Amino acid sequence: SFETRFEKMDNLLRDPKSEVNSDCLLDGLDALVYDLDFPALRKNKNIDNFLSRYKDTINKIRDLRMKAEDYEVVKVIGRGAFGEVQLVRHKSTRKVYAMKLLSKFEMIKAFFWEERDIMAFANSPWVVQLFYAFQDDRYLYMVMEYMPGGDLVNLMSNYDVPEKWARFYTAEVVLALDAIHSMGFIHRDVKPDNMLLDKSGHLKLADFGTCMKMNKEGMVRCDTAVGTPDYISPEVLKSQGGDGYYGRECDWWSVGVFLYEMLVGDTPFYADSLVGTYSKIMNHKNSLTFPDDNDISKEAKNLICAFLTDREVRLGRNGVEEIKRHLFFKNDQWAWETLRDTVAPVVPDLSSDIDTSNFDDLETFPIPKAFVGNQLPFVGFTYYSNRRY
Amino acid sequence: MSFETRFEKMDNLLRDPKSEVNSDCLLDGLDALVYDLDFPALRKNKNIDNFLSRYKDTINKIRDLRMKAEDYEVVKVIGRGAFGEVQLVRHKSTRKVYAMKLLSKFEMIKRSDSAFFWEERDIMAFANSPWVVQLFYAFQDDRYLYMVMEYMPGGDLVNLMSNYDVPEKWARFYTAEVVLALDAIHSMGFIHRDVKPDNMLLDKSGHLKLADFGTCMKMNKEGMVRCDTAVGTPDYISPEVLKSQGGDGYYGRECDWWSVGVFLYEMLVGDTPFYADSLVGTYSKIMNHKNSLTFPDDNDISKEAKNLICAFLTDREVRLGRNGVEEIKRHLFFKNDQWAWETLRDTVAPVVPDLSSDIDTSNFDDLGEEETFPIPKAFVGNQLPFVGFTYYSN
Ligand SMILES: CN1CCN(CCCOc2cccc(CC(=O)Nc3nc(-c4c[nH]c5ncccc45)cs3)c2)CC1
Ligand SMILES: CN1CCN(CCCOc2cccc(CC(=O)Nc3nc(-c4c[nH]c5ncccc45)cs3)c2)CC1
The missing domain is CATH 3.30.200.20 (Phosphorylase Kinase; domain 1)
Known part of the structure; x- marks a missing residue:
């Protein structure tokens, strides 16, 4: 009509x-x-x-x-x-x-x-x-x-992060990434620079310039590597013409790098040169080590290692619930559903x-x-x- | 803000x-x-x-x-x-x-x-x-x-004029409606510049409406307009619009009043006052309106109609309408008992379409x-x- x-x-x-x-x-x-x-x-x-x-x-x-x-x-x-x-x-x-x-x-x-x-x-x-x-x-x-x-780079540089804080910030990153994943996107550049804190000390992800919409299978087809040298996953690093098909598990590798950085003070694949970091990522099976410092718990080492593995055996291949149920997140201070209502480790003054x-x-x-x-x-x-109101 | x-x-x-x-x-x-x-x-x-x-x-x-x-x-x-x-x-x-x-x-x-x-x-x-x-x-x-x-x-009025030898009572009606119609355009801030019977249309009741506004121009602060454009067929165009060839002079709404005079003459006489075999001949007769405007020697056109045609068909400076519409409206040619200016479009038109x-x-x-x-x-x-x-x- x-x-x-x-x-x-x-x-x-x-x-x-x-x-x-x-x-x-x-x-x-x-x-x-x-x-x-x-x-x-x-x-x-x-x-x-x-x-x-x-x-x-x-x-x-x-x-x-x-x-x-x-x-x-x-x-x-x-x-x-x-x-x-x-x-x-x-x-x-x-x-x-x-x-x-x-x-x-x-x-x-x-x-x-x-x-x-x-x-x-x-x-x-x-x-x-x-x-x-x-x-x-x-x-x-x-x-x-x-x-x-x-951001978390600023926090990490001013404090020797205890495990209880690291647990909080990791848990918030996990919920934040799951929110993006549910909207149908892979972040592809998860790093502490992109983790911002509001007036109450709670986390929000920023910098979505590397975000890509997942297909019907929950995959992304890309020929060019994307992200940051230190936090890039092996499959995104080696992504090419023939290969270069990956899912949301690339963001989970980056969470492992983040947790390691917070507890250890350095990124797991740090090298004198950028090209050396690329080599260490590709050889994560032999290059991932922990310093002989009795500070990191059995549970934290297990999470870092569950994330810092090849995609096929990586924690999060079967969804968030297997991450959420990890023993490292076992605590008597917060619950996943209520976490953003709890009092943050560092409240901004x-x-x-x-x-x-x-x-x-x-x-x-x-x-x-x-x-x-x-x-x-x-x-x-x-x-x-x-605008949408 | x-x-x-x-x-x-x-x-x-x-x-x-x-x-x-x-x-x-x-x-x-x-x-x-x-x-x-x-x-x-x-x-x-x-x-x-x-x-x-x-x-x-x-x-x-x-x-x-x-x-x-x-x-x-x-x-x-x-x-x-x-x-x-x-x-x-x-x-x-x-x-x-x-x-x-x-x-x-x-x-x-x-x-x-x-x-x-x-x-x-x-x-x-x-x-x-x-x-x-x-x-x-x-x-x-x-x-x-x-x-x-x-x-x-x-x-349109061309069709009407070709089927009837227009009596003065009809000519008075159609002129009065054209006058009110042009005053409406003038009040909106425009000069029509191409007023002609082809542009005067009749609705289902026989009342007039102006059409074809393709030559319209918006008047400035002083109610004037300036142009250089070509003048497609000059039978109704005023001496000023013709003198204004190539950014020569500024003119006002009185150019549309000249065209009303041409229209009234056409209706009562059967021909346009300055018709010639060639376009250039019509231009010559317009420019020489003082000597070229004549009436046939047959008492048919009234003293009052001849006066209106001549009050409009003059040089802009002495043209009827230089002091607004009221001096046109008050002309003796419009004196009648059949209608009033304010009520005119509610009266029964001379020719009602069947x-x-x-x-x-x-x-x-x-x-x-x-x-x-x-x-x-x-x-x-x-x-x-x-x-x-x-x-x-x-
Ligand atoms: C895939 N390609 C896309 C293009 N890519 C170029 C980088 C884009 O260029 C930027 C320009 C200026 C700043 C930035 C960094 C950035 O994204 N900063 C952001 N800050 C916020 C932010 C919101 N509220 C805040 N409050 C305090 C501080 C920061 C923020 C959101 S994104 C990138 C390379 C990778
Ligand atoms: C210097 N420049 C000025 C603009 N110039 C454009 C010529 C316009 O081109 C036309 C095309 C088709 C028709 C016409 C004549 C015209 O304007 N006819 C109109 N008819 C009506 C109209 C409205 N309702 C009607 N009901 C019945 C019959 C006609 C009409 C409005 S304008 C002109 C060229 C030279």
Whole structure:
């Protein structure tokens, strides 16, 4: 019917997950105007007359919609290959956020889609939340909840982690990874840098740029290795054309590396050179050893070894319940179902909403001769006008 | 302002039918991008190829769901013009009858002149006047612009004038309606510039409505307009609009009043006051209106009608209507006991259409391959001058 067509079209515009929602449509127009406003293209009357018609409107839209100048940047609290994470305060609302910038220029010389989705729609206390996502001609912005407690790298460097704390943080990582796995993704880059603590000391996973959606069998088909030298599993490291098919058990190997790091003070496959670490991972059967220091319990050594094995015999091949039932998690202080309501080993002592005590002190595209469309791969990234409430 | 105020202003901008960024204009922007980019030569660019692949499924759905030409059953072609045709249509689903004007995008680019339809779309969509032909929907495809308007079953004034030797009482009625109709357009801030009987349509009751707003221009702060464009057939064009050839002079609403004088003369005399065998001859006679305007020596035209024709057919500076409509309205030619200006459209029209159905075309006379744009080697943006043309009434 006429009304059915009208209504199907209306739902396609409102839907927070639609490709033709208002956010995408405004992105589509903003991208057209960015890609066309160059003197060489303006020689074309179709382009020049179009830009002149939409001049006033594009300036209004740009002023009204979310932009970087809406945020007061307090401190740069993180860095990465394609940008930075900055502690911001939204000038108007006075609300405090962590804002991740991704260089459009650098990305050009697709990963952010799943990272945007996981953070925006997880609705999990274990996943860092995405409130807004916007963009300009130079960057992509992800306005997330600020994690004042810092990461696990910072914790590990300030404390000799006892087993009772290690048990807590491992248990939270396990629940956090199971939450991502249930959403249908493998993290593929589990490391203490990606484990953040909130104002109460409880964990949340961050950095979903390596996330990949599992198939019907719960596998991922990849030809290129992905992750970090120290925490990468043997099957992800050697992943190729012929082979390169793996599941959620690659994230469980990384939990074993993490537990070892916390209790031992070093990563299990540390070497003088990065290439030496690759060699030690591949030879985990002979290279995994424990120092002759009576501190690590029988149960902790067993968990580390149950995870730090070949995929086929790895703990977690039969799901989370076999991890959860491990003797290392046997304690009389918490239960799996209630864990995030318990009092954390380290409760952050914070002075303000912009306290950065857990955070250490920290070009673009040429002028196109012809239409290049550098803004086209980022159309629909905006999360503002059509958010899920 | 506040965060919520900014959020809400942006939201209302997306729903506003007067907005350049509402959903239909934004969907036009995307549909135009995909039309202009889907060529093998541009698809060599990964940004373009990946974008088109991502939006492939969506663009097909949107194209299928949105209003399109195949939604309309075309009954008869009832009009023709430089850039297309006016066809009597019935919307297949709703079963409602409309007149649909098609404007060729190929022709509008070939001949330049691809910006006239904006003021025509706005006037018809937003006039909300019994004197202005209404626009219900405006849509488009890679080749055409469509304007779905109210059908005017009574035909135009050219048809009437050709079937009757118009008496003064009818001429008074039709002139009075044209005057009220033009005043309505003027109040919206536009000068018509092409007032002619072809543009005066009659509805099912015999009352007038102006059509064809393709020459309309928005008046500035001082109520003036400036142009350089070609003047297609000069019989009704005023000396100012003709003197204004190539950015010469600024003129006001009094150019439409001159055309009313030409119209009144045509109705009572049977011929246009400045007719000539050639276009250039008509231009000469208009410019020399002081000596070329004459009346036939037959007492048929009243003192008052000759006075109105002459009050309008003079130089702008002394033209009736220089001090507004009230001086036109108060003219002795309009003095009658049959109607009042305020009530005129409620009176019984001189000629009431006798119609057999909702698709009766008795007042419409019965009525070549379509050239297409070549395959672009580089981005040309042929769909960009039509972004935002789409409009739907609620
Ligand atoms: C598969 N490919 C994808 C692209 N990959 C390039 C790295 C992406 O580039 C970044 C730019 C800036 C920062 C980062 C690190 C990062 O992801 N940081 C994050 N921080 C948070 C965060 C949320 N709330 C916070 N509160 C305090 C501190 C940090 C945060 C979420 S993700 C990466 C390489 C692997
Ligand atoms: C200098 N530039 C100015 C713009 N110029 C464009 C010519 C317009 O191209 C046409 C295409 C097809 C038809 C027409 C004539 C026309 O405007 N007819 C109209 N009919 C109606 C109409 C509404 N309801 C009706 N009911 C019955 C019959 C007709 C109608 C509205 S406009 C023009 C080119 C030169």
